[PDB]
Amino acid sequence: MQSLTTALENLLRHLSQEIPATPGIRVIDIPFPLKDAFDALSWLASQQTYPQFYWQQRNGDEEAVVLGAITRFTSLDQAQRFLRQHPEHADLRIWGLNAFDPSQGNLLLPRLEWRRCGGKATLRLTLFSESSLQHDAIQAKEFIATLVSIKPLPGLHLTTTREQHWPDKTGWTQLIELATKTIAEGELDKVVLARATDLHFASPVNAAAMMAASRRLNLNCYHFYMAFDGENAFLGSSPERLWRRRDKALRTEALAGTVANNPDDKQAQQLGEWLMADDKNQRENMLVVEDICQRLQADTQTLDVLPPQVLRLRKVQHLRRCIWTSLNKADDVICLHQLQPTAAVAGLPRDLARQFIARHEPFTREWYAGSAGYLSLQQSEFCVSLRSAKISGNVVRLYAGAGIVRGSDPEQEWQEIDNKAAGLRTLLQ
Numbered sequence: 001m002q003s004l005t006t007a008l009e010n011l012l013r014h015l016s017q018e019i020p021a022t023p024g025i026r027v028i029d030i031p032f033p034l035k036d037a038f039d040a041l042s043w044l045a046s047q048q049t050y051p052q053f054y055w056q057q058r059n060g061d062e063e064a065v066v067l068g069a070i071t072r073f074t075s076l077d078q079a080q081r082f083l084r085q086h087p088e089h090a091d092l093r094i095w096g097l098n099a100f101d102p103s104q105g106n107l108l109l110p111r112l113e114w115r116r117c118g119g120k121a122t123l124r125l126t127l128f129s130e131s132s133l134q135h136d137a138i139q140a141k142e143f144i145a146t147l148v149s150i151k152p153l154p155g156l157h158l159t160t161t162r163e164q165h166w167p168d169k170t171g172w173t174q175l176i177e178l179a180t181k182t183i184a185e186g187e188l189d190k191v192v193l194a195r196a197t198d199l200h201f202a203s204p205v206n207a208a209a210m211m212a213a214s215r216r217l218n219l220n221c222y223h224f225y226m227a228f229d230g231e232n233a234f235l236g237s238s239p240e241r242l243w244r245r246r247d248k249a250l251r252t253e254a255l256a257g258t259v260a261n262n263p264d265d266k267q268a269q270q271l272g273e274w275l276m277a278d279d280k281n282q283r284e285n286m287l288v289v290e291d292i293c294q295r296l297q298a299d300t301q302t303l304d305v306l307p308p309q310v311l312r313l314r315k316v317q318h319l320r321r322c323i324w325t326s327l328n329k330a331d332d333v334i335c336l337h338q339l340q341p342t343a344a345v346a347g348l349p350r351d352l353a354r355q356f357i358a359r360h361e362p363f364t365r366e367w368y369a370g371s372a373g374y375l376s377l378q379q380s381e382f383c384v385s386l387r388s389a390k391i392s393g394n395v396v397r398l399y400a401g402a403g404i405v406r407g408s409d410p411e412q413e414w415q416e417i418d419n420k421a422a423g424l425r426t427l428l429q
Contacts, residue, residue, distance in 0.1 A: 001043075001149060001150050003032060003033045003034075003035070003038060004038070004150075006033075007032055008123075008144060010030045011028060011030055011125050011144065012141070012144060014028050014125075015125075015137050015140055015141050019134045020133050020134065021132045021133065021134040021135070022132065022133060023129055023130055023131055023132070023133070024127075024128070024133045025086055025089065025092075025126070025127065025128045025133075026126065026127045026128075026133060027089050027092060027125075027126050028125040028127075029122045029124045029125075030123045030125070031120075031121075032114065032116075032120075032123050033121075034116065034119065034120065034121045038114070038121065039150070040054065040063060040064075040065035040114055040116075041054055041208055041211060041212050041215075041225075042150050042151070042152070042153050042208075042212070043065060043114075043150050044065045044067065044208060045151075045153060045154075045206070045208030046148055046150050047067055047146075047147060047148065048146075048148070048230075049067055049068050049143070049146060049147075050068075050228065050230065051067075051068075051069055051096075051106075051108055051226060051227060051228055051229075052065070052067050052225075052226070053065075053066045053110070053224075053225065053226050053227075054208075054223070054224070054225040055095065055222070055224050055225075055372065055373060055374065056222065057381060058220055058222045058239065058241070058383070061117065061118040062116070062117055062118070063116045064093075064095065064113055064114065064115040064374070065113075065114050066095045066108070066110035066111075066113040066114075067110060067111060067112045068108075068110060068112060068143055069108035069110065069111070070108070070109045070110065070111055070126060070128050070136075071108065071109045072106070072107070072108050073094065073096075073105060073106075073107040073108065073109075074104065074105060074106070074107075075098075075103060075104060075105045075107075076098055076107060076332060076333060076336050076375065077333045078105075079094045079105070079107050079375060080331075080332050080333055080375060082109070083375070083376065083377055087377060090376065090377045090378045091376050091377075091378050091379075092109075092126070092376055092377075093374045093375065093376045094107050094108065094374060094376070095107060095108060095113070095373075095374045096108055096226060096374075097224075097370060097371070097372050097385065098336060098340065098371045098372075098382065098385075099365075099366060099367055099370045100345075100364075100366065100367070100368060100369045100370045101370075102336050102337060102340045102341070102370065106226065106228070106367075109126065109128065110126070111126065111140065111143050112124070112143075127140055153206070153208060153212055154206045154209050155206070156205070156206065156209050156210065156213060156427070157201060157202070157203045157205075158428070158429070159201060159203070160199060160200065160201060160202075160429070161200040161201060161202050161394070162198075162199075162200035163197065163198070163199060163200070164197070164198040164200075165195055165196070165197050166195065166196040166197075166198065166362055166363045167195065169410075169414070171362065172410055172414055173410040175193060175362075176193070176404060176408060176409070176410045176413065177410070179191050179193060179356065179360075179404045179408075180404065180406060180408060182356065183404070183405070183406050184406075187349070187352065188347070188348075188352040188353060188356060189347075189348055189349075190284075190287075190343075190347035190348040190353060190403050190404070190405050191346075191347040191353050191356045191357065191403070191404050192344070192345050192346055192347045192353070192357070192401045192403045192404070193357070193360075193401060194361065194363075194365060194368070194369070194399060194400065194401035194402075194417075195399070195400055195401070195414075195417050195421075196363045196397050196398070197397070197398045197400075197421060197425070198396070198397050199395065199396040199397075199398065199428060199429070200395050201395070201396065202394070203394065204231075204393050204394050205391055205393075205395075205396050205428075207225065207227060207233035207235055207391045208225065208227070208233075210235060210389070210391070210424075210427060210428070211225045211235045213427040214236075214237045214423075214424065214427055215237070217423070217426070217427065218313075218314055218387070218423050219313075219314065220239060220311075220313060221237040221238055221313065221387065221423075222236075222237065222239070222240075222241075222372070222373075222383035223235075223236075223237050224236055224237075224372035224373070224385070226367075226372075231392060232390075232391065232392050232393075233391040234366075234367045234385075234388065234389070234391070235388065235389055236372070236385055236387050236389065236424075237387050237388075237423060237424070238372075238383045238384055238385060238386040238387050238388065239255070239311060239313050239318065239386070239387070240253070240255045240344075240383060240384040240386055241381070241382075241383055241384070242335075242336075242339055242340060242373075242382040242384050243335045243336075243339055243380070243381070243382055244379075244380070244381040245327065245332065245379055245380045245381070246378075246379045247378065247379070248327045248328075248329070248330050249324070249326060249327075250300065250324065250325050250326065250327050251322060251323070251324050252296075252323050252339060253320050253321065253323060254285055254286075254288040254289040254292055254305075254320065254321045254322075254323065254343075254344070255311065255319075255320040255344060256281075256284055256285045256288045256318065256319060256320075256403075257278075257281035257282070257284055257285045257319035258316055258317070258318055258416060259271050259274070259275050259316070259317045260315065260316060260317070260419055261312055261313060261314060261316055261317050268312055269312075271317065272310035272312060272317050273310075275310050275317065275319050276310055276319065281319055282308065282319070284403075285308065285320075285321060287343070287348060288321075288342075288343045288348075289305055289321050289323060291348060291350070292323055292339070292343065293305070293323065295338045295339065295350075296323075296339075299327060299328055299338060300325040300326060300328065301325060301327075301328065302325060302326070303323060303324075303325040304323065304324050304325065305321055305322075305323050306321060306322040306324070307321070308320065308321050309321075313423070314422075314423050315419050315420075315422040315423050315426075316420060316423070330377070332375045332380050335382075336371070336382070340370065340371060340384075341354065341369060342369075342384060344403075345369040345384065345386075345401060347403055347404075365399065367385055367388070368385060368386075368388055368390070368399035369384065369385055369386060369399070370385045371383060371385055372385050386420075387400075387420065387423050387424060388424075396428065398421050398424055398425060399421070400418070400420040400421040401417065401420070402414070402416050402420075
């Protein structure tokens with residue numbers, strides 16, 4: 001941590017310059033020599049300050065670790081409202097989560113943000129005050145004094161005390177056959193229903209270590225980690241983008257139609273070339289794109305759907321179609337509310353599917369199948385909070401969902417949710 005130390009000392013130097021004792025906002029960016037890679041995650045997990053948020057874009061070129069909440073926001077709308085009051089810092093990012101219910105978020109304007117774009121990094125310090133910048137400069141000084149040296153990530157422990165499913169196997173069929181009853185009757189066709197698996201461990205589970213474990217195995221995935229406090233965290237490694245906005249340029253995608261992966265290149269690629277020719281999944285995928293274009297059309301100019309591709313991940317492969325377009329207004333609250341929850345995580349039609357989930361699910365999804373990422377005026381990117389876990393002390397809660405459709409069948413969809421959960425379960429068991 002000679003890079004960090006040096007950066008911290010440049011920052012303390014800046015904070016010792018005259019700062020005006022008037023309301024305002026300052027952004028201090030210190031260049032971060034990236035002669036080696038920096039284990040931003042290990043650094044974050046060494047700190048006793050909360051909240052912490054860690055995020056890496058799925059391609060591996062963009063990474064951030066942010067610490068300490070100058071201000072918290074309970075929705076993305078309230079976040080964007082704050083940013084619009086400061087248009088002179090167009091690149092000022094707010095970081096965190098949106099819940100499965102998108103009117104609810106946990107987002108922060110961080111004290112400190114280390115951010116790498118591929119080859120370059122910046123340690124950014126911000127000051128903000130309704131009253132005195134000089135005052136908050138004092139806080140920043142104290143917050144720096146608070147930071148400790150990078151310690152080795154702690155270990156994962158593998159001793160299990162219990163294993164609960166919500167719903168269990170019988171409750172799953174109880175619910176599945178209810179859902180097909182309901183499909184039988186009305187105009188609902190697809191409903192995505194979830195399971196929670198609670199893993200109870202004899203020791204408290206270190207969430208950053210779990211995250212570090214996931215990053216090694218779960219390639220080509222967004223990695224996201226929020227430490228709300230010392231006892232509670234939510235994290236995941238999702239292959240799915242909700243949206244990316246650069247100015248008004250928007251990218252989203254219809255990621256639906258699942259097979260299992262196999263480690264041999266040929267058998268996985270036969271399992272995939274199959275997926276691309278299966279009329280049916282291609283139909284299911286196409287109903288997802290239609291729904292996305294529908295949801296988008298009144299707020300965008302031309303929508304371009306790209307050719308299908310198979311996305312090979314660790315335990316599981318997906319059919320995806322990307323959809324690019326331009327937004328009429330550079331607005332993140334529109335992207336959020338138009339795109340979440342996805343047709344891939346609620347089902348179809350939108351209202352009816354959400355209403356079934358609301359009516360009937362035996363546990364709250366909370367942050368599962370919301371989104372994670374950041375927004376600034378200039379750009380934003382959120383992933384869907386899939387392949388994720390909620391960590392509370394000694395309990396780890398894994399989430400995975402399946403799209404019930406008519407012929408479904410309990411046990412097959414259950415097996416599918418096992419495979420989706422696998423990408424995380426295998427790090428712990």
